[PDB]
């Protein structure tokens, strides 16, 4: 299935003899675990991206954005452990190495210094549009895979992402922001 990279129930290793997918069938785990690993990688990447833009912003919107990004991080950060632990509970092993983040995240972290407010905000709004829709879609997929438990987690994460999206989109809805 589509989550082999995150599946730990079939490993040829020590201290692994009991690992299983609990109440999920194999294909159901594959569906759910693909979502959890992707969203975990995406969340960690949003932390890193919000931090890089918070460190790099300059100009007259510095206080607006520097502080906002830290508030947004505070909202999303607890979901890192929550998503990873859910995956573990279902018989997965979460990936968090840089190369794995890059492969599985739907959000790319900047390698350049972006000083420009509009450039940062527009980039983040595009990211959050994708991530929020992703959580809505992934909630429905999990529920269909007989995992209402993970879906419930995603419903809350989507609400948070959708809120952050609104705020950022509002800031940039302004022709005076160059």
**Near its own copies in 2-21, by CB under 8 A:** 8, 11, 13-19
**Which DSSP letter does residue 176 get?**
T
Using the rule CB under 8 A, which residue among 36, 46, 124, 153 binds its own copies?
Answer: 153
**Residue 28 or residue 123: which is nearer to Zn ion going by CB?**
28
13 Cα distance to chain centroid: 29
93 binds, among its own copies, Fe ion, Zn ion, none (CB under 5 to 8 A by kind): its own copies
Residue 32: which of 74, 77, 70, 86 has the closest Cα?
A: 86
Encoded tokens for 63 = 């206080």
21 is in an annotated binding site: no
**Residue 64 or residue 116: which is nearer to Fe ion going by CB?**
64
**Which DSSP letter does residue 121 get?**
H
Cα dist. 82→78, 106, 158, 173 in Å?
7, 18, 14, 33
38 binds, among Fe ion, Zn ion, its own copies, none (CB under 5 to 8 A by kind): none
**134-140 CB contacts, 8 Å cutoff, 24+ apart:** 134/38, 134/39, 134/42, 134/106, 135/39, 135/161, 138/35, 138/39
Binding piece for Zn ion, criterion CB under 5 A, among 9-17, 80-88, 110-118, 159-167: 9-17
22 binds, among its own copies, Fe ion, Zn ion, none (CB under 5 to 8 A by kind): its own copies
For Fe ion, the binding residues (CB under 5 A) are 64
Contacts with Zn ion, residue ranges (CB under 5 A): 7, 9
């Amino acid at each position: 299935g589509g989550a082999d990279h995150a599946d730990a129930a079939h490993l040829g290793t020590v201290n692994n003899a009991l690992v299983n997918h609990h109440y999920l069938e194999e294909k159901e785990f594959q569906t759910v675990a693909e979502t959890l690993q992707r969203n975990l990688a995406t969340t960690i990447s949003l932390y890193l991206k919000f931090k890089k833009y918070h460190w790099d912003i300059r100009g007259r919107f510095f206080r607006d954005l520097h502080l906002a990004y830290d508030e947004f991080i505070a909202e999303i950060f607890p979901s890192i452990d929550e998503q990873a632990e859910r995956l573990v509970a279902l018989g997965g092993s979460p990936l968090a190495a840089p190369a794995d983040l890059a492969r599985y995240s739907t959000v790319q972290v900047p390698q350049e210094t972006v000083r420009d407010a509009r450039t940062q905000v527009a980039d983040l709004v595009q990211d959050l549009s994708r991530v929020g829709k992703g959580y809505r879609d992934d909630s429905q997929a999990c529920d269909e895979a007989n995992d209402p438990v993970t879906a419930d987690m995603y419903n809350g994460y989507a609400a948070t992402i959708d809120k952050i999206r609104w705020m950022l989109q509002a800031i940039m809805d302004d022709e005076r922001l160059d």
